[PDB]
CSV table of C-alpha atoms and ligand atoms in Angstrom, one decimal:
chain,number,residue,atom,x,y,z
A,7,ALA,CA,-89.4,124.9,-151.5
A,8,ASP,CA,-89.7,127.2,-148.4
A,9,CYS,CA,-91.4,130.1,-150.3
A,10,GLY,CA,-93.9,132.2,-148.3
A,11,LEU,CA,-92.8,130.9,-144.9
A,12,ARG,CA,-91.3,133.7,-142.9
A,13,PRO,CA,-88.3,133.1,-140.7
A,14,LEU,CA,-89.6,135.3,-137.9
A,15,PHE,CA,-93.2,134.1,-138.1
A,16,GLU,CA,-94.3,130.7,-139.7
A,17,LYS,CA,-90.8,129.2,-139.2
A,18,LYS,CA,-91.1,129.9,-135.4
A,19,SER,CA,-94.9,129.3,-135.2
A,20,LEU,CA,-95.3,133.0,-134.3
A,21,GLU,CA,-98.3,135.0,-135.7
A,22,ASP,CA,-98.1,138.6,-136.7
A,23,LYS,CA,-100.7,141.1,-135.3
A,24,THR,CA,-103.2,141.1,-138.1
A,25,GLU,CA,-102.9,137.8,-140.0
A,26,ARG,CA,-106.0,136.5,-138.1
A,27,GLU,CA,-108.0,139.2,-139.9
A,28,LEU,CA,-107.1,137.6,-143.2
A,29,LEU,CA,-107.9,134.1,-142.0
A,30,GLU,CA,-111.3,135.2,-140.6
A,31,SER,CA,-112.2,136.7,-144.0
A,32,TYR,CA,-111.6,133.3,-145.7
A,33,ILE,CA,-115.2,132.1,-144.9
B,1,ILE,CA,-100.0,153.4,-148.0
B,2,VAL,CA,-102.9,155.5,-146.7
B,3,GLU,CA,-104.6,154.5,-143.4
B,4,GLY,CA,-102.3,151.5,-142.7
B,5,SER,CA,-99.9,150.7,-139.9
B,6,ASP,CA,-96.2,150.3,-139.3
B,7,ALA,CA,-95.1,146.8,-140.4
B,8,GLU,CA,-93.6,144.4,-137.7
B,9,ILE,CA,-89.9,143.4,-138.2
B,10,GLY,CA,-89.7,140.5,-140.7
B,11,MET,CA,-93.4,140.7,-141.5
B,12,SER,CA,-92.9,141.1,-145.3
B,13,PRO,CA,-89.4,139.6,-146.0
B,14,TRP,CA,-90.1,139.5,-149.8
B,15,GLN,CA,-90.6,143.3,-149.8
B,16,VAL,CA,-88.2,145.0,-152.2
B,17,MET,CA,-87.5,148.7,-152.6
B,18,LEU,CA,-86.8,149.9,-156.2
B,19,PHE,CA,-84.3,152.7,-155.6
B,20,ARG,CA,-83.2,155.4,-158.1
B,21,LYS,CA,-79.4,156.0,-158.0
B,22,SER,CA,-79.6,159.7,-159.1
B,23,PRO,CA,-81.4,161.6,-157.6
B,24,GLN,CA,-81.4,159.1,-154.7
B,25,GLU,CA,-85.1,158.3,-154.3
B,26,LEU,CA,-87.8,155.7,-153.9
B,27,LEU,CA,-88.8,154.5,-157.4
B,28,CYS,CA,-91.4,151.8,-156.5
B,29,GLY,CA,-92.1,148.6,-154.4
B,30,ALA,CA,-91.3,145.2,-155.7
B,31,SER,CA,-91.2,141.6,-154.4
B,32,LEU,CA,-88.6,138.8,-154.1
B,33,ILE,CA,-89.7,135.6,-156.0
B,34,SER,CA,-86.4,133.6,-155.9
B,35,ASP,CA,-82.8,134.3,-155.0
B,36,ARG,CA,-82.4,136.0,-158.4
B,37,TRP,CA,-85.8,137.2,-159.6
B,38,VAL,CA,-87.7,140.3,-158.5
B,39,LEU,CA,-91.4,141.0,-159.6
B,40,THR,CA,-92.7,144.6,-160.1
B,41,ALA,CA,-95.3,146.6,-162.1
B,42,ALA,CA,-94.3,147.5,-165.6
B,43,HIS,CA,-95.3,151.2,-165.0
B,44,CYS,CA,-92.5,151.4,-162.5
B,45,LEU,CA,-90.0,151.0,-165.3
B,46,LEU,CA,-91.8,152.2,-168.5
B,47,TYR,CA,-94.4,154.9,-168.5
B,48,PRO,CA,-94.2,157.3,-171.6
B,49,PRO,CA,-96.9,159.8,-170.3
B,50,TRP,CA,-94.5,160.8,-167.5
B,51,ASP,CA,-91.2,160.2,-169.6
B,52,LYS,CA,-90.3,157.2,-167.4
B,53,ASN,CA,-88.1,154.7,-169.2
B,54,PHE,CA,-85.6,153.2,-166.8
B,55,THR,CA,-82.7,150.9,-167.9
B,56,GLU,CA,-80.8,148.4,-165.7
B,57,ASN,CA,-78.1,150.8,-164.5
B,58,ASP,CA,-80.5,153.5,-163.5
B,59,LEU,CA,-81.6,151.6,-160.4
B,60,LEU,CA,-80.8,149.3,-157.4
B,61,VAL,CA,-83.0,146.8,-155.6
B,62,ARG,CA,-82.9,147.0,-151.8
B,63,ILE,CA,-84.0,143.8,-150.0
B,64,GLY,CA,-84.7,143.2,-146.2
B,65,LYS,CA,-85.6,146.8,-145.5
B,66,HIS,CA,-87.9,148.3,-142.8
B,67,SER,CA,-86.9,151.9,-142.5
B,68,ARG,CA,-87.6,154.0,-145.7
B,69,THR,CA,-84.6,156.3,-145.7
B,70,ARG,CA,-81.9,154.7,-143.6
B,71,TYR,CA,-79.1,152.5,-144.8
B,72,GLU,CA,-79.9,149.4,-142.7
B,73,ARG,CA,-76.3,148.1,-142.2
B,74,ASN,CA,-76.0,144.3,-141.7
B,75,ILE,CA,-79.7,143.8,-142.5
B,76,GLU,CA,-80.6,145.1,-145.9
B,77,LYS,CA,-78.9,143.8,-149.1
B,78,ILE,CA,-78.4,146.0,-152.2
B,79,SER,CA,-78.4,144.2,-155.6
B,80,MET,CA,-77.7,145.3,-159.1
B,81,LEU,CA,-79.9,144.4,-162.1
B,82,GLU,CA,-78.7,142.1,-164.8
B,83,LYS,CA,-81.8,142.5,-167.0
B,84,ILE,CA,-85.4,144.0,-167.0
B,85,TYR,CA,-88.2,142.1,-168.8
B,86,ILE,CA,-91.5,144.0,-169.4
B,87,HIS,CA,-94.6,142.1,-170.5
B,88,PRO,CA,-94.7,142.5,-174.3
B,89,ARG,CA,-98.5,143.3,-174.1
B,90,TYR,CA,-98.3,145.8,-171.3
B,91,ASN,CA,-100.9,148.6,-172.1
B,92,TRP,CA,-99.5,151.9,-170.8
B,93,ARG,CA,-101.7,153.9,-173.2
B,94,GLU,CA,-105.1,153.2,-171.7
B,95,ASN,CA,-105.5,151.2,-168.5
B,96,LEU,CA,-102.2,149.6,-167.5
B,97,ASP,CA,-103.4,146.2,-168.7
B,98,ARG,CA,-100.7,143.5,-168.0
B,99,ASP,CA,-98.9,145.9,-165.6
B,100,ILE,CA,-96.1,143.5,-164.8
B,101,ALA,CA,-92.3,143.3,-165.1
B,102,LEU,CA,-89.5,140.9,-164.0
B,103,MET,CA,-85.9,142.0,-163.0
B,104,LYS,CA,-83.1,139.4,-162.9
B,105,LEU,CA,-80.4,140.1,-160.3
B,106,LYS,CA,-76.7,140.2,-161.2
B,107,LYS,CA,-75.9,137.9,-158.2
B,108,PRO,CA,-78.2,135.7,-156.0
B,109,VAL,CA,-79.4,137.3,-152.8
B,110,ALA,CA,-78.7,135.5,-149.6
B,111,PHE,CA,-81.8,134.7,-147.5
B,112,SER,CA,-81.9,135.8,-143.9
B,113,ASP,CA,-84.5,136.5,-141.2
B,114,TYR,CA,-85.4,139.7,-143.1
B,115,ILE,CA,-85.0,138.4,-146.8
B,116,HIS,CA,-87.2,135.5,-148.0
B,117,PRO,CA,-89.2,134.9,-151.2
B,118,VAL,CA,-93.0,134.9,-151.4
B,119,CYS,CA,-94.8,132.1,-153.3
B,120,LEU,CA,-96.5,132.6,-156.7
B,121,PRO,CA,-100.0,131.1,-156.9
B,122,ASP,CA,-101.0,128.1,-159.1
B,123,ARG,CA,-104.5,127.8,-160.7
B,124,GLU,CA,-106.0,126.2,-157.5
B,125,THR,CA,-104.5,128.8,-155.1
B,126,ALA,CA,-106.0,131.6,-157.3
B,127,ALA,CA,-109.4,129.9,-157.5
B,128,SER,CA,-109.6,129.3,-153.8
B,129,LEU,CA,-108.4,132.7,-152.5
B,130,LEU,CA,-109.4,135.3,-155.2
B,131,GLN,CA,-112.9,135.8,-153.9
B,132,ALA,CA,-114.9,138.9,-153.1
B,133,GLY,CA,-114.6,139.6,-149.3
B,134,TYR,CA,-111.4,137.6,-148.8
B,135,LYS,CA,-108.7,139.9,-147.5
B,136,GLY,CA,-105.2,140.4,-148.8
B,137,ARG,CA,-102.3,142.5,-147.5
B,138,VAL,CA,-100.5,145.4,-149.3
B,139,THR,CA,-97.2,146.8,-148.2
B,140,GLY,CA,-95.1,149.8,-149.3
B,141,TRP,CA,-93.1,153.0,-148.5
B,142,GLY,CA,-95.4,155.2,-150.6
B,143,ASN,CA,-97.4,158.3,-149.6
B,144,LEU,CA,-99.3,158.3,-146.4
B,145,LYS,CA,-101.9,160.6,-147.9
B,146,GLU,CA,-103.1,161.4,-151.5
B,147,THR,CA,-102.1,165.1,-151.1
B,155,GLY,CA,-96.2,162.8,-145.9
B,156,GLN,CA,-93.8,159.9,-146.2
B,157,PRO,CA,-93.5,157.1,-143.6
B,158,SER,CA,-90.4,156.4,-141.5
B,159,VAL,CA,-90.9,152.7,-141.8
B,160,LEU,CA,-92.6,150.1,-144.1
B,161,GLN,CA,-96.5,150.4,-144.0
B,162,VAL,CA,-99.1,147.6,-144.0
B,163,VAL,CA,-102.8,147.5,-144.7
B,164,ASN,CA,-105.2,144.5,-145.0
B,165,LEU,CA,-108.0,145.0,-147.7
B,166,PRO,CA,-110.9,142.9,-149.0
B,167,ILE,CA,-111.1,141.9,-152.7
B,168,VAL,CA,-114.1,143.6,-154.3
B,169,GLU,CA,-116.8,142.2,-156.6
B,170,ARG,CA,-116.0,142.7,-160.3
B,171,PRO,CA,-119.2,144.7,-161.0
B,172,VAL,CA,-118.5,147.0,-158.0
B,173,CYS,CA,-114.9,147.6,-159.3
B,174,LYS,CA,-116.3,148.3,-162.8
B,175,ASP,CA,-119.0,150.7,-161.5
B,176,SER,CA,-116.5,152.8,-159.5
B,177,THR,CA,-114.6,154.0,-162.5
B,178,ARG,CA,-114.9,155.3,-166.1
B,179,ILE,CA,-111.7,153.2,-166.9
B,180,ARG,CA,-112.1,149.9,-168.7
B,181,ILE,CA,-111.3,147.0,-166.3
B,182,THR,CA,-109.7,143.8,-167.8
B,183,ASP,CA,-109.5,140.2,-166.6
B,184,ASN,CA,-105.8,140.9,-165.8
B,185,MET,CA,-106.8,143.2,-162.9
B,186,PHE,CA,-108.7,143.0,-159.7
B,187,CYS,CA,-109.7,145.7,-157.2
B,188,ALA,CA,-109.6,145.8,-153.4
B,189,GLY,CA,-110.6,148.1,-150.6
B,190,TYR,CA,-113.4,148.9,-148.3
B,191,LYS,CA,-116.8,150.3,-149.3
B,192,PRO,CA,-118.0,153.7,-147.8
B,193,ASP,CA,-120.6,151.6,-145.8
B,194,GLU,CA,-117.9,149.4,-144.3
B,195,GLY,CA,-116.4,152.2,-142.1
B,196,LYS,CA,-112.8,150.9,-142.3
B,197,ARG,CA,-110.3,152.6,-144.7
B,198,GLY,CA,-107.0,151.9,-146.4
B,199,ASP,CA,-105.3,151.9,-149.8
B,200,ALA,CA,-102.1,151.8,-151.7
B,201,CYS,CA,-100.8,155.2,-153.1
B,202,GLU,CA,-98.0,156.8,-155.2
B,203,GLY,CA,-94.7,155.1,-154.3
B,204,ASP,CA,-96.5,151.7,-153.4
B,205,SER,CA,-96.7,150.8,-157.1
B,206,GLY,CA,-95.0,147.5,-158.0
B,207,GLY,CA,-95.4,146.2,-154.4
B,208,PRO,CA,-97.2,143.0,-153.5
B,209,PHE,CA,-100.8,142.2,-152.6
B,210,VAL,CA,-100.4,138.9,-150.6
B,211,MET,CA,-102.7,136.4,-149.0
B,212,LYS,CA,-101.9,133.6,-146.5
B,213,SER,CA,-103.3,130.3,-147.7
B,214,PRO,CA,-105.4,128.6,-144.9
B,215,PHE,CA,-104.6,125.2,-146.6
B,216,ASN,CA,-100.7,125.2,-146.4
B,217,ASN,CA,-100.1,128.3,-144.3
B,218,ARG,CA,-97.9,129.9,-146.9
B,219,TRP,CA,-98.0,133.5,-148.2
B,220,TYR,CA,-98.9,133.9,-151.9
B,221,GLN,CA,-98.5,137.0,-154.1
B,222,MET,CA,-101.9,137.4,-155.7
B,223,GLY,CA,-101.5,141.0,-157.0
B,224,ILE,CA,-99.2,143.8,-157.8
B,225,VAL,CA,-100.0,147.4,-156.8
B,226,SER,CA,-101.0,148.9,-160.2
B,227,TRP,CA,-103.2,152.0,-160.2
B,228,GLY,CA,-106.0,154.0,-158.7
B,229,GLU,CA,-107.7,157.4,-159.1
B,230,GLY,CA,-106.5,159.3,-156.1
B,231,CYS,CA,-105.8,157.4,-152.8
B,232,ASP,CA,-108.3,156.1,-150.2
B,233,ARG,CA,-111.2,158.0,-151.8
B,234,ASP,CA,-114.8,156.9,-150.8
B,235,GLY,CA,-116.4,154.8,-153.5
B,236,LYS,CA,-113.0,154.2,-155.3
B,237,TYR,CA,-110.8,151.1,-155.1
B,238,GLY,CA,-107.2,150.2,-155.6
B,239,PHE,CA,-106.4,148.2,-158.8
B,240,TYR,CA,-103.9,145.3,-158.8
B,241,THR,CA,-102.3,143.2,-161.5
B,242,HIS,CA,-103.7,139.7,-161.4
B,243,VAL,CA,-100.5,137.6,-160.9
B,244,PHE,CA,-101.9,134.2,-161.7
B,245,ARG,CA,-103.5,135.4,-165.0
B,246,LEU,CA,-100.0,136.3,-166.1
B,247,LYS,CA,-98.1,133.3,-164.7
B,248,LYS,CA,-97.6,131.7,-168.1
B,249,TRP,CA,-95.5,134.9,-169.1
B,250,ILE,CA,-93.7,134.8,-165.8
B,251,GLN,CA,-92.7,131.1,-166.2
B,252,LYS,CA,-91.7,131.6,-169.9
B,253,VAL,CA,-89.3,134.4,-168.9
B,254,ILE,CA,-87.8,132.5,-166.0
B,255,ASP,CA,-87.5,129.2,-168.1
B,256,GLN,CA,-85.7,131.6,-170.6
C,3,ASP,CA,-83.7,162.7,-147.3
C,4,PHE,CA,-82.1,159.3,-148.1
C,5,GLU,CA,-79.0,158.2,-146.1
C,6,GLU,CA,-76.0,157.6,-148.4
C,7,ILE,CA,-75.4,154.0,-149.3
C,8,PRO,CA,-71.9,152.5,-149.5
C,9,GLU,CA,-69.8,153.4,-152.6
C,10,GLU,CA,-69.5,149.7,-153.5
C,11,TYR,CA,-73.1,149.8,-154.7
C,12,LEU,CA,-72.1,152.4,-157.5
D,301,LIG,C1,-102.5,159.0,-157.2
D,301,LIG,N1,-102.2,158.8,-158.6
D,301,LIG,C2,-103.2,158.7,-159.5
D,301,LIG,O1,-104.4,158.7,-159.2
D,301,LIG,C3,-102.8,158.4,-161.0
D,301,LIG,N2,-103.8,157.6,-161.7
D,301,LIG,C4,-103.3,156.7,-162.8
D,301,LIG,C5,-102.3,155.7,-162.2
D,301,LIG,O2,-102.6,155.2,-161.1
D,301,LIG,N3,-101.1,155.4,-162.8
D,301,LIG,C6,-100.4,155.8,-164.0
D,301,LIG,C7,-99.1,155.2,-163.4
D,301,LIG,C8,-100.0,154.6,-162.3
D,301,LIG,C9,-99.7,155.1,-160.9
D,301,LIG,O3,-99.6,156.3,-160.7
D,301,LIG,N4,-99.8,154.2,-159.9
D,301,LIG,C10,-99.6,154.8,-158.6
D,301,LIG,C11,-100.8,154.4,-157.7
D,301,LIG,C12,-100.8,153.2,-157.1
D,301,LIG,C13,-101.9,152.9,-156.3
D,301,LIG,C14,-103.0,153.8,-156.3
D,301,LIG,C15,-104.2,153.5,-155.4
D,301,LIG,N5,-104.5,152.2,-155.1
D,301,LIG,N6,-104.9,154.4,-154.9
D,301,LIG,C16,-103.0,155.0,-156.9
D,301,LIG,C17,-101.8,155.3,-157.7
D,301,LIG,C18,-104.4,156.0,-163.5
D,301,LIG,C19,-105.5,157.0,-164.0
D,301,LIG,C20,-106.6,156.3,-164.7
D,301,LIG,C21,-106.1,155.4,-165.9
D,301,LIG,C22,-105.1,154.3,-165.4
D,301,LIG,C23,-103.9,155.1,-164.7
D,302,LIG,C1,-87.1,153.2,-173.9
D,302,LIG,O1,-85.7,153.1,-173.8
D,302,LIG,C2,-85.0,152.3,-174.8
D,302,LIG,C3,-83.5,152.5,-174.5
D,302,LIG,O2,-83.1,151.7,-173.4
D,302,LIG,C4,-85.4,152.6,-176.2
D,302,LIG,O3,-84.9,151.5,-177.1
D,302,LIG,C5,-87.0,152.5,-176.3
D,302,LIG,O4,-87.6,152.6,-177.6
D,302,LIG,C6,-87.6,153.6,-175.3
D,302,LIG,N1,-89.1,153.8,-175.4
D,302,LIG,C7,-90.0,152.8,-175.2
D,302,LIG,C8,-91.4,153.3,-175.4
D,302,LIG,O5,-89.8,151.6,-174.9
D,303,LIG,NA1,-117.6,152.0,-165.1
D,304,LIG,NA1,-111.9,153.8,-151.3
């Protein structure tokens, strides 16, 4: 389904202000 | 949430507020897992040490919220509960082992820009993301300090902590159904969940499929944001078989 | 300090 894809972020290819911090921690 | 920040609009569209009808107050956080199911911590609903034993008609679920206190007309949706399901092996006597509960909604919630379900992890998601140092995100309308209250939803990103470090921070017995997260005193950075954040989600964004997964449920701690202490979370994947059994019916 | 919610929500 479309679980975990946010209409105002992933669905528009927009990133929130701190999600990069999570990505950078997935080493 | 202690030492967090205001959430952005639509940042956590699966965020649910568990709201007590009388007196009108914040009961707990929770999360939207489908158009009819809400996930929370069992201690939000059943906690005999504090004479907490809520039934379906005692509360409402408020979805799509940002502001803590305001009635967000045309944005938030308020739903009634059909039935509560508490894990049959929830341990409220000792350490909140299996601190998990499901709530079925009377009617399906309509999804919008502000209302959207989070994913639940499978075995591979959990194995790939639930690693010491990997950061998750906790959200809630709970206390800003251990000893006021936020105007809007709060957010904090926190690293998962090594099981021995979790174990060595407390006198409480830690189980495989829990994990701990937060910064070490040597890390400099702060942050934690607190009273009122219970039942809310600990989420991670998969770098493989770019979807958000709920890995944890805000469960317990000893104080809030104390040096050398960590927040404890219900391990969602470890209890997925119970989740699926209840949803399958 | 919670704003009243519409009566329809009981
Ligand atoms: C501030 N409250 C406490 O320290 C009570 N501490 C108890 C606790 O946390 N309980 C019993 C029901 C649940 C609760 O109050 N949860 C709210 C909460 C959520 C997150 C955090 C955190 N990450 N810091 C702290 C509290 C905790 C004491 C040790 C044995 C397990 C239960
Ligand atoms: C909680 O409330 C119900 C009534 O809805 C009662 O049957 C039950 O035994 C109470 N106590 C516990 C510990 O569940
Ligand atoms: Na210990
Ligand atoms: Na700490």
